[PDB]
Amino acid sequence: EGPDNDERFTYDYYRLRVVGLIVAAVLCVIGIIILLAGK
Amino acid sequence: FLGRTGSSWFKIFLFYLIFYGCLAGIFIGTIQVLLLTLSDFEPKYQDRVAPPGLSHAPYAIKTEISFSISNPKSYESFVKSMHKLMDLYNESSQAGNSPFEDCSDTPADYIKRGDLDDSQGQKKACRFSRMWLKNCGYAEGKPCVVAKLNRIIGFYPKPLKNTTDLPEELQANYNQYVLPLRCAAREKIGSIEYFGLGGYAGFPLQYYPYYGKRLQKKYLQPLLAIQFTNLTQNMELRIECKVYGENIDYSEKDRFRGRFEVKIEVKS
Amino acid sequence: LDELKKEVSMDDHKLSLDELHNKYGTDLTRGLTNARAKEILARDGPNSLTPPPTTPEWIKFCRQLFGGFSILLWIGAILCFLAYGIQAATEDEPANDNLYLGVVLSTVVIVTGCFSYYQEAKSSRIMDSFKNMVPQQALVIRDGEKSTINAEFVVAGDLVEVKGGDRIPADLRIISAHGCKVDNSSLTGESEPQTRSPEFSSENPLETRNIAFFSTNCVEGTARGVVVYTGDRTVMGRIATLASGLEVGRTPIAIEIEHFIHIITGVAVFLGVSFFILSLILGYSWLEAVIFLIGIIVANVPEGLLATVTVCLTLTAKRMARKNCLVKNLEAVETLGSTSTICSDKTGTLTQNRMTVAHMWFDNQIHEADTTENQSGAAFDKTSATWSALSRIAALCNRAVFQAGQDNVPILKRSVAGDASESALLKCIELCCGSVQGMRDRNPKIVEIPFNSTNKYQLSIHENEKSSESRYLLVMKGAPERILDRCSTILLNGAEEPLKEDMKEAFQNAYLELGGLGERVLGFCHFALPEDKYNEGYPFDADEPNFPTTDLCFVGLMAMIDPPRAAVPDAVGKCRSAGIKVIMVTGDHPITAKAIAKGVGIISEGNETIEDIAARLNIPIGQVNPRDAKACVVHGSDLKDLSTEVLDDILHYHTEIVFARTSPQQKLIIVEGCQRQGAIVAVTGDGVNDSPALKKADIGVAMGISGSDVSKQAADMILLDDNFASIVTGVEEGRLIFDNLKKSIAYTLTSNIPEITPFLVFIIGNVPLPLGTVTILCIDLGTDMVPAISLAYEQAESDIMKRQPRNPKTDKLVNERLISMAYGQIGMIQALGGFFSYFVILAENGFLPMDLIGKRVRWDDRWISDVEDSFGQQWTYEQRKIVEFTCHTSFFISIVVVQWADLIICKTRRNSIFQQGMKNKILIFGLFEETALAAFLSYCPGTDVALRMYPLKPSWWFCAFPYSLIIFLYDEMRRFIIRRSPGGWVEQETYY
């Protein structure tokens, strides 16, 4: 917007962290699954 | 030789020459495409400069400016940087209707020169006289520090509204058009005196938004001179200058995020 | 020091009984005086063995703390505290950087110390096992009276008494004996009881009957003797000292480790000081000049590599534990793969160590029995009525019996009370005719004449199990020729017939052939006594010939030997196909040694000794060109008078070598001889007479079930199931781990470049620091760890058992070809991918690449809280630093992303991934966990403080992707060239 362009200097680092941690966890689980296919 | 024969030494050179040549050519290629994705007028991200920093002229050894009044070369270090800044706000530097403009001698509203486009020439910036900085060689006794708000493209500094209570409760509250700056230390052993545009202790909103170096060269940002004619002597005084606003915030880590940290000591 | 002990012993068995007493001031009848014995005790010292001085574990741990990498990491750790000290004095720095980094680095050294300490283990209790062979007490005659004393109180000169069941307390001169037999397997590896008597019977004291040795035991009878040697001075006490004293030495794998440590340490100190001066010339304060150096150290040293090696070794040892192959020393996991020569004991190693029936001669025909443990062969005969007649004599004319409670274990494995030949016959019949006890119940023995020294035969009279007869049957066995002189008829295919010169000659032929096979041959015959001349109550006199022992019926011959273990012949061939030379080294007699050599394939068909040529051509041995003989058989008595140079010629000039009747020191000498030629040697054995050889071997392998305690103490590896096929597996595993270590090392080293280059450009370019010191440790100690380990699970790229053993002088673990690829090619591509992401982060935040050159001065200036970017914006100190640390984080993640491809390319040295596939599940695990770790380190809240890791935006992850891919393609194209032309260019330059 014009004088109300506050969103330009903002970033949702909170969501990014939530998503990043979700991904890291799921990649960790997936890895266990493939490894445990025989121990 | 060490490793191989001459014939082998050559071949290993012909390889790494072509190899590193290709790698350099590829690296450069990826730099090209990166630049191709970027604007010339505005950076891709601005969230890391977001809350504006407040910086001053006196080059602090460690957020400190200690010196002796009864000594000449005791403050000549801080006068070097003080001069460096103010030397830019000369009238001879601001000549003709291009690229400067005479703006309200009193704090006014924002000025939009269109978009961040080259569809116009150099966006015309507001003039600023160093003569608006009353009282301030500089203050040989009781320094005359000069404040400054860090430039951010497209940033509209918004002052606080007088809805509720305020630190400098309602005094000279130019609510609509001034970004205030109140310095503090309890520990009230000083004498705060502020100088600026229109005589106000703030930044005139008519100097915003900044259009960037590419669209606004020679542009001048507003200054706020602060003088501490304190009646005390020979002690470290931790003075903090704070700016207030809707778009202004602070951090415990970044001690320059919209504020000062000055340790004055007139040890004379 | 031990050169004296490598020699054959001298003795006094030639002296008379009386003469021997003069030498030791002793009485043959009364024995020593209580006072004289005590005098000699203080004089000579105790009858005991003293363990050699060991190196305390303290010094062993700390010796690792100073080996190249640890030295450099120490210099870094101290240089951290140096810069910290210089700070704490000058400008009060409230930070924790140099202090904490100095603590972290010192911990890295200590923990790395534990890993190398675990790898360099030496579990040796040789002298302890020997000490276990000295009895607690001994029986001596002192002042004309016998008393038990502490065996340590035994001295040279006293009169000692031994009987069946006790250990020989010291080396004795036999002066009196009654039916005394002894087990000399300690000195020979052969357990067949040896008679002891006062009479001298051989010039060689290790063969004479009038000497009994410490480390052996009396098996039966009784004997008295004069002590000639005590403690360390006994024959086997010296073997003890020799074995326990032998310097261990460095393994092939250990030597390789130290070698690349020198290389990497070299480049480290080179670039280290090369850029330390390069910085001072550029006008960098010593305050900074050291900080850069610390970074250089951390970049160059692969902090997690030595521990990787240890883990890869450990994991390989775990797989072998699961095949009944115990590894006592982690490094011995690889030595077997580098082995070019095997020196093998015969008895209990190549052989089962059990007299077993091998052939039978009946019906004018040679039949072969199955000698294998698990009986993997086939039948020979069951139909012939002759067989049942021979079978009956083998069961009936036999006094051996199975021990109680064995019905659970297999026939051939069960313990038997009796001599070896009777046990063999027992197990033979029990196997192919069912319960022998049944046959001995159906045919009650009424009278017998046990085998006599003079008779040379054993006879028995039984009540025929037949109801229509129920009469008296006579059976006998003995020396083949003696049995022949007592026969008139031969049981041919059922019916008897006269013994004509024809069948008599066929007997001699059969007899000579079986004997030629190194087999012990016995004759078997029976006689159905006439009914009218022998009533159902007729008494037989065993003392005086009350019955005919002539004109009997010859039934057949039976031959026997201590046979090879089932898997041994095939394992020997497999070792030989892998280009390993196999030598036999045994305490056993030459005829037996040679026969098993041919049986297991040590001596291949057609190959001759000089003696074979001479006999075939009917010419003198001196007339034979010795170069015409590729095979040789050396008796220990001849070995004794040969110099080592002459032993070296024997080793060089023969492909098929048998060392027979060797002493324990002689085995050591042969091992050393092989090593002297530059060969990596394995020893396989099971006896105490293998102990010195096992110790000296680059790798000693002991048998687990049949092995003596001493042998297993001297070994690096134990075959817990006595499965000789494990040697073949061991060499295969050893070769595989050697290749996989290269892959894992290249992988680990490759990521050094992207950690070095940022520090260099930081100096030469004056740009903001692309990657931090902490960030490097997050790679080498964090992300790269599991991937690097996972390479240990790689399958072979080709048939490794088809290639020759590596040349330890030329074929190195880390060579110039590895460095060229890891440092010069792949690591260089990784460095760029790192830098790219660095420029991306900065440029997208407003600092374009062009304006970055020569900005570090203002960038690092803590007092400039207004640096101008390319777009004209102003940054505080902490703001720009957050972007900088975000650059460290994405550079870090870029390494991880480019290590993805590197992990896949390091999978194979030659083959394509499209050929080798992706069947390594540990490797895939590594990829997932590596990425999980990196993501966690970036996104986990608080890690921005502890490690300066900042959250990355999604687009950031993909910066290095095009570089990761170029690596995969590049290496795949390169290896395509290798395969397409075995010539050499790409091969001799980059083939690890």
Ligand SMILES: *[C@@H]1O[C@H](CO)[C@@H](O[C@@H]2O[C@H](CO)[C@@H](O)[C@H](O)[C@H]2NC(C)=O)[C@H](O)[C@H]1NC(C)=O
């Ligand atoms: C900007 O203004 C300052 C004001 O102090 C100028 O300083 C002058 O310097 C000259 C020569 O050194 C002196 O003679 C004068 O006394 C100073 N003041 C004035 C008001 O003229 C400075 O030169 C100016 N800089 C530029 C680039 O124009």
Ligand SMILES: CC(C)CCC[C@@H](C)[C@H]1CC[C@H]2[C@@H]3CC=C4C[C@@H](O)CC[C@]4(C)[C@H]3CC[C@]12C
């Ligand atoms: C950061 C940049 C400027 C550094 C570049 C370093 C280059 C020149 C280095 C890195 C790895 C190096 C190579 C590594 C391996 C070998 C094989 C050896 O048998 C001869 C030297 C040779 C061929 C080296 C020559 C120089 C080399 C290519």
Ligand SMILES: *[C@@H]1O[C@H](CO)[C@@H](O)[C@H](O)[C@H]1NC(C)=O
């Ligand atoms: C500042 O200077 C003015 C003259 O320009 C003078 O009148 C005044 O006293 C000064 N103020 C202070 C606080 O010293």
Ligand SMILES: [K+]
């Ligand atoms: K050994």
Ligand SMILES: [Mg+2]
């Ligand atoms: Mg043996």
Ligand SMILES: [Tl+]
């Ligand atoms: Tl490293």
Ligand SMILES: [Tl+]
């Ligand atoms: Tl590394």
